[PDB]
Design a protein around this ligand. Sequence first.
Ligand SMILES: */C=C\C(=O)N1CCN(c2cc(-c3noc([C@@]4(C)CCCc5sc(N)c(C#N)c54)n3)nc(N3CCN(C)C[C@@H]3C)c2)CC1
Ligand SMILES: Nc1nc2c(ncn2[C@@H]2O[C@H](COP(=O)(O)OP(=O)(O)O)[C@@H](O)[C@H]2O)c(=O)[nH]1
Ligand SMILES: [Mg+2]
Length: 164
Amino acid sequence: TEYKLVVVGACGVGKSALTIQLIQNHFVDEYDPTIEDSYRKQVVIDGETCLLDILDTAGQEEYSAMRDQYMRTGEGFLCVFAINNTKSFEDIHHYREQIKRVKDSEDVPMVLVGNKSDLPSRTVDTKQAQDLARSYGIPFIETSAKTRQGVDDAFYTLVREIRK
Ligand SMILES: */C=C\C(=O)N1CCN(c2cc(-c3noc([C@@]4(C)CCCc5sc(N)c(C#N)c54)n3)nc(N3CCN(C)C[C@@H]3C)c2)CC1
Ligand SMILES: Nc1nc2c(ncn2[C@@H]2O[C@H](COP(=O)(O)OP(=O)(O)O)[C@@H](O)[C@H]2O)c(=O)[nH]1
Ligand SMILES: [Mg+2]
């Protein structure tokens, strides 16, 4: 069963590192910030043999029909910010609104992801992020691509939401 997932958020939050942890089970601390591609992973989720097709976004900020059609292929979206970057969290509402527009839906499967949870000096609090996820009616997952904390929780929760 195929699930088309899209990982979005400001560049530098760890979209690539999270995707590589899921696919390859290791931390890649350096990955060209301009590389945008789809990566496939066969995994078992709640007994179902899944094919995850994950689009790790980069590109340009472009509101063309071509880019909208490309993003519209996504079934579920991980909206990622970094816990030590207030700007990336403030940007979440823009990503949520563009997803809602291209999918033409108020309940697109989404998970709010607070990455870099291994770091000791945060600027965005768990309470404010939990509250934003509550405003959207979506789950909030704390992750670390460095340690693998929350990686399956984020992706598998998104699959469960698509499956529902
Ligand atoms: C690291 C790579 C890089 O240089 N960039 C440039 C900045 N950039 C970017 C993209 C977006 C943005 N807004 O929506 C999207 C997605 C990818 C989200 C899913 C749905 C759709 S439909 C569609 N078309 C697009 C696109 N593009 C999307 N990406 N926003 C921003 N900014 C930064 C400036 N700020 C005032 C507004 C917004 C938060 C930047 C791409 C990565
Ligand atoms: N400490 C820490 N650094 C991370 C984590 N995820 C990514 N990084 C770092 O954050 C930067 C951006 O990562 P990258 O995967 O390129 O993010 P992207 O631009 O969103 O694809 C790099 O310096 C990574 O080493 C994480 O969970 N913890
Ligand atoms: Mg990247």
